[PDB]
Ligand binder design. Structure first.
Ligand SMILES: O=P(O)(O)OC[C@H]1C[C@H](OP(=O)(O)OP(=O)(O)O)[C@H](O)[C@@H]1O
Ligand SMILES: O=P(O)(O)OC[C@H]1C[C@H](OP(=O)(O)OP(=O)(O)O)[C@H](O)[C@@H]1O
Ligand SMILES: O=P(O)(O)OC[C@H]1C[C@H](OP(=O)(O)OP(=O)(O)O)[C@H](O)[C@@H]1O
Ligand SMILES: O=P(O)(O)OC[C@H]1C[C@H](OP(=O)(O)OP(=O)(O)O)[C@H](O)[C@@H]1O
Lengths: 389, 389, 100, 389
């Protein structure tokens, strides 16, 4: 109950950020609440035609910490498919305890991993397409500001080299990235805007000039070459109506610059980009990318949380598989097999042994380890992404 | 800088929930900041093959209130296309003042109207498809909890009769909606779960029994008919793997019940529904719908904010149209024409006059009127939706 | 443009090719504030620059009207069909150059 | 200004075969005409999803010869893509001189290389499909007679073994090809027509009998086998309405003939054929092909001519790349790189060096060499086609 239409940390920790049916149900359970011990696993019902970059667990731990519950989960930054080598739904997190003790957090728990995972996953796809070239997350403006930090966080972990959001950058412990806007050229004109921008580019940072405000990207690039020398990048946000063939335009520009002996001036692009768009433009000559919407508004994975066991006995509903289970992965080929919890390791043909990926993060509500910082996590994520081409 | 990865009301009001390039630019503008008066209009670059249910302005006013800026906008709950009768981009909100005075809020302003509008718009499409039958917003679990209230808000305004979120319901001033979950049947069994659920259904509320936990929807429905009498609804969340032909199953169930003289038992459905899904199931016999994901994770409209005027003179970049402008609509056929601000009304062939829709909400940072409550807004929205079949 | 206007004769309408160097939009504004008796503005916009020709024509027509020059008609050419011509005429074009 | 609606050699040399805007413009340039030295290169805007067999330069030289202009160009019969290994538009001909001196010839210059190149290119595709079997150009009847010779010329150079046009054949210095028409059978009947045709087949030429006039190709073939002995070919122009499955019919015919010990009688086909049609029929058993329309009316490449330099300084418009340039090709793999004129050779990975393909054909209006005859050119063309499967 704050200024904007949002739930505060307090609200979500109090369980006010959830569906009423939960508390109403717990209430209905009454005295029986004490003798109701369950284990619930979270699986992906959502898109199965893609792998996923798991992200958002950090938020889950911050919420369940303190409650008398054991919590297992796959570490953020891991990349794998929603179904194992044999089509078994893979459980990303498991929670054990009194149903009534944490049941009202289903809503929040899902929310913390659904949207985030979609975001980190899209960034990963974009990462693969950007290759050795850098791309940055510029999409918070597309979503509610209240969640601007988690977006950049997942984007970063997903593979984004940098991030534009102030708070998101703070969260990942990196300096925000940002270039002069069109606004500047509209108010002061290109010449004065570029001068101001070059004069104000500081530290170990590269100068970048926005050139599609008024002129034709081609002639704007020439004008800049003959007007300034120390300019690292030329950024193009070319209006879609002007974007007849972006690839061709980038080439035209690159040739014109080389002709004037300025092949040193790199080219950056932004505005409505994908893994697809990014890949084709990088092949055209682009070396820096600004990616937003496609990542920030990435569709969320449809995670579901279900009781898979009741007071030690396997129990579920139709469409779900009962029993607590582990997620074994080949330390070599990364083959994955979902198995019953009473199986820790297994022999993986080709490579070696399959060890469990599901790690215990909470024990009786207490953190079993120190949670990794974002940079550490995206570090894992990139090694992880290496296995997907 | 709070517990979860979110920006607090304080953070966003301080402008910490934005791209660094803004402050960095303002800073670069320096002394010139005082003599830089601009007017920026917000237009939809996003999906143009659809109309839109504008929503989120409330958040914008709560943010800009206090600043020396005049603000015009189309009222939330209005429904129209992103381009006028002649393909001119329609401006949904206009802001006038010193660029440096509010420039850092571009990020937040967009975020407040992009995601929300997508949500309210999808709910509207779902509304049209539900007809006289009720549908509720059950999708917050799919997104970050921090924004669970704004989601239900837009969903409600979009046409949802009810909402499941606790905070969202508080915000719209309506009681949250919710039915017994599968969890209850897994822990206590159907028989005991249905009894508990019927015993705990109170007030002017209708009883609803979740029947797809263990049995076949068909036989579960029969068992319920011969077991209880006062049961208003039968809810089916049938697992997709069991959903061979949902329509056919609903019919099978409805016939079986009628045969046993229980045609009074209505049928509710939920789980992966659209305007499409909802329409076909309503034709099959469903009378109540639970809709989530499709609405809560609805793609956002790609709003852009651009300077359209500088110190009284028309000014913009390529791909944008300069000058402050009004949005005139036929009070009859609702034909829309974007025109230069110096045109208040116009004659609309067929019907009568075209009046301006862009209303001044803030004058020098002060609210020019009392903002409508959600119910009032969705009331407008439904009259508005009436014009679209 | 000066040469072209100076050499337009007889019962003929002046037409200025504006997509050589600038952005059609700003080139149109520059022309409005620079010359008065100009009957047409011709756009042969390179395909690589033709992201959405229809939208560009509109942008241009609005900009000109804003400056009270709605009298300046718009002509188009370059890779046109019955299809292309029909959609551009609906966008605002009033003269077409059709070849290939 | 002659009998038919055509421009005579005189008319085109006088520049009457062009758009008025040229002379009108030159005139407008006036006194400035003397100090306007430009270099214009011709590039393909046209179809880029295919390689091209350049043809028509011969006509260009015959027109520009005499004028004070230097002219470089890729030799006719060369085959390559419109864009180099890196997507740079490839210039096929360059002209240097006073703009006013030759500017009015843009129209004609393009016309000479646009239509022709399309024709030679299609013939090349047909060549590849005909394999070691011969195909002839029979399509002049589809286009205006005034240009019947240039059509056969390009068709020949493209790979056609022979040509039907009288003048075109004269131009390539080969005897025209031609078989008895249906007309003969309609006027005299098959029996008398075939006799006449066999009696009048002379020199080192093969007898060919048109058999689809009256009978069923199958029985007509049998009748011919048992009626004549020295018959080299059986030609089928089967009406499309009778062409249920041409491939199957050819087989039926070939079997019937073999059964009667006449497998020596080869089969020729014609009428609405492509690279596709030709390939499938050759696999069915056809050994000779008559191809017209598809080649004679082949779509033209959309060549454009643009000033790429003005008085020694690089200059162009948007969408074009400035500066005079060379077209380097790997003498091995035939990799192509468009480069600035000040680069003659380059090292081509894999194979060896890349030499320039753009050759100087005119120097101050004077031929720098003796132009190759058609046969010589198509000889080059076939070696050239060898690199494309
Ligand atoms: O999140 P980003 O990747 O930065 O892009 C978000 C918007 C903006 C950009 O268009 P605009 O520049 O707003 O205009 P237009 O659609 O005309 O190209 C792009 O086409 C997307 O629709
Ligand atoms: O937001 P909602 O409309 O409620 O639905 C969100 C999820 C859940 C439901 O599937 P599950 O019941 O989780 O399982 P399954 O996919 O197997 O049907 C549906 O198919 C969507 O994927
Ligand atoms: O016969 P017309 O209708 O006049 O047009 C013929 C060519 C030229 C024009 O392109 P260019 O201006 O040559 O270049 P681009 O293809 O890059 O647009 C058009 O796209 C056609 O391909
Ligand atoms: O240039 P050519 O390859 O020789 O073909 C040109 C025409 C003639 C032939 O049909 P006809 O024999 O005129 O009649 P039909 O279409 O009925 O087969 C073929 O189908 C093409 O349409």
């Amino acid at each position: 109950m704050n200024v904007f239409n949002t739930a505060s940390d307090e609200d979500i920790k109090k369980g006010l950020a959830s569906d009423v049916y939960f508390e109403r149900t717990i209430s209905a359970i009454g005295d029986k609440c004490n003798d109701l011990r369950v284990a619930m696993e979270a699986t992906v019902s959502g898109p199965l035609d893609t792998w996923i970059n798991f992200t958002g667990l950090d938020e889950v731990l911050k919420l369940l910490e303190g409650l008398d519950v054991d919590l297992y989960a796959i570490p953020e930054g891991t990349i794998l498919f929603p179904r194992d080598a044999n089509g078994l739904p893979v459980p990303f997190i498991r929670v054990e305890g009194r149903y009534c003790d944490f049941g009202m957090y289903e809503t929040a728990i899902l929310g913390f991993i659904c949207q985030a995972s979609g975001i980190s996953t899209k960034a990963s796809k974009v990462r693969l397409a950007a290759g050795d070239s850098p791309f940055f997350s510029f999409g918070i403006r597309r979503m509610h500001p209240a969640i601007s930090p988690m977006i950049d966080r997942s984007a970063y972990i997903g593979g984004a080299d940098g991030v534009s959001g102030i708070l998101g950058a703070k969260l990942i412990d990196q300096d925000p990235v940002g270039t002069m806007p069109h606004a500047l050229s509209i108010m002061l004109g290109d010449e004065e805007a570029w001068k101001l921008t070059l004069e104000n580019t500081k530290n170990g940072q590269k100068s970048v000039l926005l050139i599609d405000t008024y002129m034709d990207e081609k002639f704007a690039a020439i004008k800049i070459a003959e007007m300034f020398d120390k300019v690292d990048y030329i950024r193009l946000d070319t209006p879609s109506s002007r974007r007849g063939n972006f690839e061709a335009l980038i080439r035209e520009v690159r040739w014109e610059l080389a002709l004037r002996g300025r092949s040193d001036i790199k080219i950056m692009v932004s505005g409505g980009l994908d893994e697809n768009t990014v890949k084709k433009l990088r092949e055209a000559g682009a070396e820096a990318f600004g990616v937003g919407t496609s990542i920030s508004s990435a569709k969320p994975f449809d995670f579901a949380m279900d009781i898979v066991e009741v007071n030690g006995k396997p129990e579920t509903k139709r469409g779900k598989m009962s029993g607590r289970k582990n997620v074994l992965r080949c330390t070599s080929c990364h083959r994955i097999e979902v198995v019953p919890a009473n199986v820790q390791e297994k022999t993986c043909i080709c490579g070696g042994s399959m060890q469990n990926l599901l790690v215990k993060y909470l024990s009786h509500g207490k953190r079993t380890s120190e949670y990794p910082r974002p940079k550490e996590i995206r570090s894992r994520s990139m090694k992880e992404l290496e296995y997907f081409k």
